[PDB]
Design a protein around this ligand. Structure first.
Ligand SMILES: C[S@@+](CC[C@H](N)C(=O)[O-])C[C@H]1O[C@@H](n2cnc3c(N)ncnc32)[C@H](O)[C@@H]1O
Lengths: 1057, 288, 163, 326, 50, 49
């Protein structure tokens, strides 16, 4: 694999036809075809038509009579649409028929036409001395030995050389030629040594290391810029060739060193050649913007010289001084010795300098194509920044990047219609309990809910999340892209909600095509509209479970109370336009017709009635607690007396409020109603305003009352705020290893040279940080970074400031990205519900870990790749016992970490519990290390053994998470099975096997028979506000729906001694 | 007006970056000759295609030269003075002995094809009588044939005179690479450390007995009232090949006069070349 | 919940691009798109064509040469049917390519182009004293501190204000 | 260039382990063969063939023909999730809508989508995805991702694979398709091996395809590939990690490592995709825990391993196809 | 400016006015010569304004 | 103009405190020779960078 292997051959001599072929090489009979005769592309954005001919024709100088042909006039038939094949094909057939090369057919088997000379002869209408030489003796063009082909012309003309102009490979660019080739008399190597030595005295001239037909030729440039672009394209060719030559693959390329030698040139060329011969670039299959190439490579010289060790630097300087030298790797020269041994007559550029050493330097990344980089920065590296200067990110325009308040949802259409109920648990409601909860209600009401929870409630508004999804449903409709969905299906309801017009159906499966003359206006939804739709879906899905069509039953009716319910009634009415006799009434104050406008309490004479009632009445706000209590009571009373099935919103869901509600329904009906506290997925994610489903059933409702229900806990654990909520700041300066920063972001731009340092400093605070350049022209790199508390809780365990800065140096300048288009980041990014749950759990644990005294260390079993670390204070030692945490002992030693990469043993005898240590057991009991589910009895064995080991030690606190069984019966009833879903009775977290669930009473039973003190605890709303504000994460909508049930039903056990 | 609008909005001029791509001014502004020495070029002569103003681009593409870039071979063999490292000159037209039709006359005829359609467009837009149209059209055909007549005397007989004249000893600077879009003459100066430099080339306002003022109208007599030896219709006047000795002897006379001219000043300047001096404190750093 | 909470910021200073961006903010290469580059609606009943440009272009004083463009002649191709996307898109692409703001590119990371002043300068064909001030020294449009951006123009022109 | 059926390109061929135990002397005897085969490189002839008949060049005329029939409207019928659909997603750089489950949405009248841009390792990653859906269950006709499930694709330049995969699964709800690896443009995360210690990637599936750093100690490639398999297995129930240097010692130390991490043995098998380069010895290893104990966990003399083992230092420079005339 | 904005606007004014007078002429069956004359007088004013 | 704006922002004039340090006004004002006999100096000749 070490030696280079290649089948070198002159492709240009190969391209030249035998003389008899010349009459037919124009193919007068057959029509030219793409992918063979030619290829043409319309670069749609640049509005340019590039036509490259193929085969022998690919090198061709057009006669001015050739340019008078229509085929070249074709681009001017446009802008802009691509030339239809049929016009192009036949016009090309016409001009190809037009060309009649002079030649002499011959029966000898060794002759080949001198394609270049004959084409150049014809191109000048044969008035050049080489042209008339072709005319009087066309047989001269024929040749066997490739070199003598031009020799016979030189001797016949008595001239020292010939200058051939070169056409653009694109044949639609009638523009000035960059340069022109000059074939030289040569033929002995010595004549070449002379021609080059003399060539040093000229101006803008360059040669390849080896020449086609074994005849020396030198390019001569009209201007230094044309030279720069040529040298660039060829440096790139030599790199792309070397990249596979080093991989040992066979290479059929024409010459071993495709790089040009600057026989005479400007400084920029000498430097381009010097940096070009060093092969700095890493192999890259990504498409390059070939147009900006020179600039790119010059920037690369500008970087290579800027950061190379002094000996490499001096080597590039030597290279830059002996520009007429051809520097080359030893393997290259070995290949040359091979081809000289094979063909002794061959000419090669003589003035080479072999590299005894291939230089030791990092390969540079280079993707000149579109795409912002999203670096996943590592906490530690080779470089040690003893003290770094502050980096000031120059402020960004919104033209280059915007920052919205909240990330819009990206979700499936079915997901938005996804309710998640909570059934009542307690069997009775003793009179003292009512007082004890009444005080909590009067207090929570008179002293309002947290400003942070309320701000989040009113910041991530659901309409803004849903809108891009609902808007996309609309745009596919009006352009006719949609045409198939079942009637009554949720996608149909979504179409009714995305367009303000009737939806006819030519058949049950096919949508009626949009009438040709018009485009319907987008549907107008208020923020509470989609929630009302999801409550309707919840009602049809609670009336019966298996239903596919959410259409109203015939001869049935429904009412929608509450302000501004008009869009809901419109989408509902038009959704049910097909079903016969479907009344859909509307009600509420501020309600335009069709909706009745009425105020709460409803007028005493009025007697509303339906099969269904989606009450959604808002609180009047400015009132006594006695007032909101009596008002909501009468609202539920009226909502229940009229409908067999109901779904009334509760603005202030105190345990006392809801239990007094069930007490009221029992007071009215005798037999208890079957209530459940629903929470729609289309409802605002942070809203605590849960709904209560209500329906009488023939069976008596055992356990009618709620207590400690998750829907209620969303409202109860919310309390008066201690301080004003954190507002996502966007700081620009990057201090090195400085702890102080607000939650938020790190937007800015900085010069590409100081860019690696920027990421080398940025790593201290940010788990990842996207970076890009507007263009190859731009000297700056735009940079965005979220500030994650976990990484800050990792990098700040010690004063050490290691970083992968040396690797980041390779990305400069082209390895950092490019994106002319705007990017829109968000002050609040989306994340999955389970990750947020782990954040609330880590906050619930971390804010207790601070209050405790004496315990030196945190042993977090199951803390994969230090996920648990945000819990741990910077002074504390941290130990992980996960047989999946990869070990770098340098990082263990660096951040005061210790990691035992063995499975933790749950047996009581071998357990190594210790005094004054905090044992974290977060979601580890549920799974074996390989990922197989642990049976519930085995989990009981795990908690039993851990409490048993904990009985015999001081200052030990354990936090063992467990999924409760009671969630299953919840999730089986609810539709929002996204991410968290029941399967075979086992709860399934995303990216996990379903895991069997423990019973809580059994857990407290084993924990009380063990006799150890214990506290069931679950993260609360303040924890949610803490995590979502601190990380910059925003709640998902379906995630917001599922999150309360998911959180209350995975309690953490807190053992303590 | 619309074509000109998009055009002049692109910029009246442009420069060439180190990348080599043209970058336009974006700013309407009359050209003045001072700009000729700078990095700027006039925009009409750029030949960068522009959307919506293609007609101006075509008419400007009527201005592209038909000649070629001859190497000043004989002058190099004779070691005549030459400011360029590779002397070259642009001949206005190639010789075309063989063809049934002069390529030069053909191109001029296509030029009058474009120009005639432009004047017909302009005439019909401006409600002109058909007779006056027939008259301009006929005058245009007339010029086309007159050009067809003199085209030989240019391509075949003036081209040689431009080539031998290209080789003369005194024509030392390069004049034109033949590419209007990127041409800029090399600008040597006589720099001095002890004075401001003198450009060899500037707008000094020495019109040289009026020589530097250019009457383009000279094309009219040349096309339409001057016979050429090569175009008899056929007297067959014998061609004249001038004795080299006359132009050679005046060239040489100019040269020797020039050297002998510089000589006395150049001698004293050599004698005093070391005489320029700088004031210099010498602080002492030793006891003695 | 009682105290007001808000992230106040100057949206107009935010809208202004860095100077290197100015050459490409006209987006000569890419075709403009609805919901981003612009939004246009045909109020079918009023038979009126409302076209609002977006981004930095949303605040822009057209030159009288800019009004001579076909894109503004588009409503008069009608009444009444809404302009087909393809005519509007490309005409907008043409006029957007037509605008060449004067500026000086700079390697500093803190500069932003004075979008308003440069657009107003171009709009008058640079014959206003602020306009010719932009012409002779385009780098003046560049600024770091948002306030000094107009100050440097006031001091340079010696004038008490600008309309 | 290859001439082949579209289904053929998605065709993996595994090799299950045979030996029931791994005695300590055998590890030394294979360790010497590994250190020797690594420090003294593989044959220049096998490597030249490995790098000459590149798979992209073979596949391209087939993949290009799939494209040309599309843009002229010649294709219009294929089932969703079918391998021909994946091939269309791989032959065209645009979204593929379906007016029905059987009928492709007609190409919009005003435009022709640009050809899809594949790097040489793209099609191999696609075939490994097909291998994963076909190893999760055998009879499947649609290779669409299951709803509410995710997958990650480690390795340099995995972008085209993630694009074709994402657009292939555009219809299925909630289908995350993450990307990773050094030199990786967005959507793909750019990260270097070893993965950062804080980072915690996780999915139902992991098609690891990490390349060797080449310039390193054998101890280095051993520890690095070990940590790569460790991370690749801890995150996914099902995995398909590439082994650049499949010595019997390497792979058996890999199974030894998985037993060291999980207790119970993983059900490994050495897969080799048909879309992989024909001469490459870089076989993949499928990895999945099962409730049953894995009897005969270890490999020896397996064919996938023999492709690498019987390759040795070349005696002479490989024959290069001359074209003589006389 | 290379071109007075005032003269430019007057020229577009005479563009509109000239097309209005050509419309009026063709509707009223006028001879082409008298049309050439009004059109020429219009161009004449355009340059005088210039 | 820009360099001008910075300079005049420093002040068109200055005094010289007992330390000898210059103290610029921060203010633009037209000079008058009424100032020649006072503490103030034109700032253009401060020769302070
Ligand atoms: C729940 S998972 C990791 C998720 C963790 N909660 C986090 O924040 O990233 C727990 C990890 O601990 C390891 N593990 C599982 N069971 C274990 C056990 N019984 N003893 C020690 N480690 C175990 C597994 O490798 C598993 O990946």
């Amino acid at each position: 694999m070490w030696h280079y292997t290649s089948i070198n051959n002159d492709t240009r001599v190969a391209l030249d036809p035998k003389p008899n072929q010349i009459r037919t090489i124009t193919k007068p009979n057959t029509v030219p075809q793409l992918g063979t005769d030619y290829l043409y592309t319309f670069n749609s954005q640049r509005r340019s038509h590039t036509l490259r001919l193929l085969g022998p024709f690919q090198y061709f100088n057009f006669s001015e009579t050739d340019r008078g042909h229509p085929l070249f006039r074709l681009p001017l038939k446009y802008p802009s649409k691509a030339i239809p094949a049929d016009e192009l094909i036949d016009n090309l057939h016409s001009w190809m028929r037009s060309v009649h090369l002079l030649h002499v057919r011959s029966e000898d088997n060794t002759l080949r036409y001198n394609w270049m000379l004959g084409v150049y002869a014809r191109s000048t209408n044969y008035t050049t001395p080489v042209g008339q030489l072709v005319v009087n003796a066309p047989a001269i063009l024929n040749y066997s030995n490739p070199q003598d082909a031009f020799n016979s012309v030189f001797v016949a003309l008595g001239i020292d050389y010939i200058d051939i102009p070169i056409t653009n490979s694109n044949i639609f660019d009638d523009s000035s030629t960059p340069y022109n080739v000059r074939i030289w008399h040569a033929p002995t190597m010595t004549e070449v040594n002379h021609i080059l030595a003399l060539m040093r005295k000229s101006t803008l001239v360059s040669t390849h290391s080896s020449w086609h037909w074994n005849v020396l030729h030198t390019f001569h440039y009209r201007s230094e810029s044309d030279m720069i672009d040529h040298f660039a394209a060829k440096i790139l060719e030599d790199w792309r060739q070397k990249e596979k030559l080093d991989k040992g693959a066979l290479v059929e390329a024409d010459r071993v060193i495709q790089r040009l030698i600057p026989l005479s040139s400007s400084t920029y060329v000498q430097r381009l050649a010097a940096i070009g011969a060093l092969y700095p670039n890493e192999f890259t299959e990504n498409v390059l913007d070939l147009s900006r190439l020179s600039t790119a490579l010059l920037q690369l010289s500008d970087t290579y010289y800027q950061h190379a060790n002094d000996q490499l630097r001096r080597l590039y300087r030597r290279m830059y001084n002996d520009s007429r030298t051809l520097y080359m790797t030893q393997r290259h020269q070995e290949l040359l010795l091979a081809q000289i041994t094979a063909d002794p007559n061959i000419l090669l550029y003589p003035y080479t300098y072999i590299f005894t050493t291939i230089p030791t330097s990092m390969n540079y990344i280079s993707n000149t194509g579109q795409g912002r980089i999203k670096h996943s920065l590592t906490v530690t590296g080779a470089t040690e920044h003893d003290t770094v200067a502050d980096i000031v990110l120059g402020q960004t325009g919104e033209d280059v990047i915007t920052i919205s308040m909240v990330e819009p949802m990206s979700i499936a259409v079915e997901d938005m219609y996804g309710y998640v109920l909570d059934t009542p648990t307690r069997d009775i409601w003793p009179a003292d309990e009512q007082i004890e909860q009444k005080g909590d209600a009067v207090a929570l009401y008179d002293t309002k809910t947290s400003r942070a929870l309320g701000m989040f409630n009113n910041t991530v508004r659901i309409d803004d999340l849903l809108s891009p999804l609902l808007s996309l449903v609309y745009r596919t409709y009006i352009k006719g892209d949609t045409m198939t969905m079942t009637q009554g299906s949720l996608d149909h309801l979504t179409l009714c909600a995305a367009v303000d017009s009737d939806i006819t159906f030519v058949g049950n499966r096919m949508i009626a095509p949009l009438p040709e003359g018009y485009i319907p206006k987008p549907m107008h939804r208020n923020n509470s509209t989609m929630k009302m739709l999801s409550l309707y879906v919840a009602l049809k899905k609670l009336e019966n479970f298996a239903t596919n069509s959410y259409l109203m039953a015939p001869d049935t009716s429904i009412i929608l109370l509450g302000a501004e319910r008009e869009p809901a009634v419109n989408i509902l009415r038009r959704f049910n336009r097909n079903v016969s006799n479907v009344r859909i009434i509307g009600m509420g104050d501020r309600a335009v017709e069709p909706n009745i406008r009425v105020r709460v309490p409803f007028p005493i004479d009025k007697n509303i009635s339906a099969d269904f009632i989606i009450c959604d009445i808002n609180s009047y706000e400015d009132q006594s607690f006695e007032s909101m209590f009596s008002e909501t009571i009468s609202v539920v009373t009226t909502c229940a007396s009229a409908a067999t099935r109901a779904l009334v919103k509760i603005n202030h869901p105190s345990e006392y409020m809801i239990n007094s509600v069930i007490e009221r329904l029992s007071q009215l009906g005798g037999v208890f109603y079957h209530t459940a506290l629903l929470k729609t997925a289309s409802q605002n994610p942070y809203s605590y305003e849960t709904y209560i489903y209500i329906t009488p059933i023939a069976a008596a409702v055992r356990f009618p009352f709620y207590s400690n229900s998750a829907m209620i806990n969303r409202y109860m654990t919310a309390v008066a705020d201690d301080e004003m909520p954190i507002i996502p700041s966007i700081h620009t300066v990057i201090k090195g290893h400085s702890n102080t920063y607000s939650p938020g972001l790190f937007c800015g731009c900085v010069d590409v040279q100081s860019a690696p340092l920027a990421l080398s400093q940025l790593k201290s605070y940010c788990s990842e940080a996207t970076t890009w350049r507007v263009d190859s022209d731009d000297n700056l790199v735009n940079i965005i970074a979220r500030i994650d508390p976990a990484r800050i809780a990792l990098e700040f365990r010690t004063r050490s400031n290691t970083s992968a800065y040396h690797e980041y140096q390779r990305y400069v300048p082209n390895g950092l990205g490019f994106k002319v288009r705007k990017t829109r980041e968000f002050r609040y990014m989306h994340r999955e519900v389970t990750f947020i749950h782990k954040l609330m759990m880590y906050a619930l644990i971390r804010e207790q870990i601070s209050l405790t005294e004496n315990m030196t260390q945190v042993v977090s079993i199951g803390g994969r790749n230090l996920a648990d670390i945000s819990v741990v204070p910077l002074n504390m030692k941290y130990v992980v016992i996960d047989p999946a945490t990869r070990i770098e002992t340098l990082t263990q030693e660096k951040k005061n970490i210790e990691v035992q990469s063995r499975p933790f043993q749950f047996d009581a005898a071998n357990m190594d519990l210790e005094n004054n240590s905090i044992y974290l057991f977060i979601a580890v009991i549920m799974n074996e290390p390989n990922g197989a589910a642990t049976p519930a009895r085995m989990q009981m064995d795990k908690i039993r053994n851990v409490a048993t080991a904990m009985l015999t030690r001081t200052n030990c606190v354990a936090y063992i998470s467990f999924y409760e069984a009671g969630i299953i019966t919840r999730l089986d009833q609810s539709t929002a099975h996204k991410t968290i879903r029941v399967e075979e009775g086992r709860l399934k977290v995303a990216n996990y096997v379903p895991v069997d669930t423990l019973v809580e009473a059994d857990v407290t039973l084993m924990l009380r028979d063990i006799g150890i003190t214990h506290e069931i605890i679950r993260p609360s709303t303040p924890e949610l506000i803490d995590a979502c504000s601190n990380y910059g994460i925003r709640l998902g909508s379906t995630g917001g729906a599922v999150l309360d049930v998911f959180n209350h039903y995975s309690p953490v056990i807190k053992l303590v001694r | 007006p619309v074509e000109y609008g998009i055009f002049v909005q692109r910029g009246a001029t442009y420069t060439i970056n180190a990348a080599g791509e043209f970058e336009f001014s974006g700013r309407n502004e009359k050209w003045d000759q001072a700009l000729y020495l700078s990095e700027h070029f006039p925009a009409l002569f750029s030949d960068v295609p522009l959307a919506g103003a293609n007609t101006i681009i075509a008419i400007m593409r009527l201005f592209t030269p038909q000649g070629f870039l001859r190497t000043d071979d004989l002058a190099i063999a004779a070691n005549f003075p030459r400011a360029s490292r590779n002397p070259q000159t642009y001949i206005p037209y190639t010789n075309q002995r063989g063809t049934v039709t002069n390529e030069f006359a053909s191109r001029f005829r296509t030029i009058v094809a474009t120009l005639a359609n432009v004047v017909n467009e302009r005439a019909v837009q401006d409600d002109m009588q058909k007779a006056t149209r027939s008259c301009t059209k006929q005058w245009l055909r007339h010029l086309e044939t007159q050009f067809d007549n003199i085209a030989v005397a240019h391509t075949d007989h003036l081209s040689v005179v431009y080539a031998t004249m290209s080789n003369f000893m005194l024509n030392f600077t390069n004049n034109f690479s033949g590419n209007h879009a990127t041409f800029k003459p090399d600008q040597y100066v006589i720099t001095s450390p002890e004075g401001s430099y003198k450009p060899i080339i500037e707008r000094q306002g020495e019109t040289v007995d009026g020589l530097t003022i250019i009457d383009t109208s000279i094309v009219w007599p040349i096309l339409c009232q001057c016979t050429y030896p090569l175009v008899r219709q056929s007297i067959m006047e014998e061609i004249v090949y001038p004795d080299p000795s006359t132009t050679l002897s005046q060239s040489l006379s100019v040269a020797q006069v020039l050297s002998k001219l510089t000589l006395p000043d150049a001698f004293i300047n050599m004698i005093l070349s070391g005489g320029d001096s700088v004031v210099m404190r010498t602080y002492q750093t030793e006891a003695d």
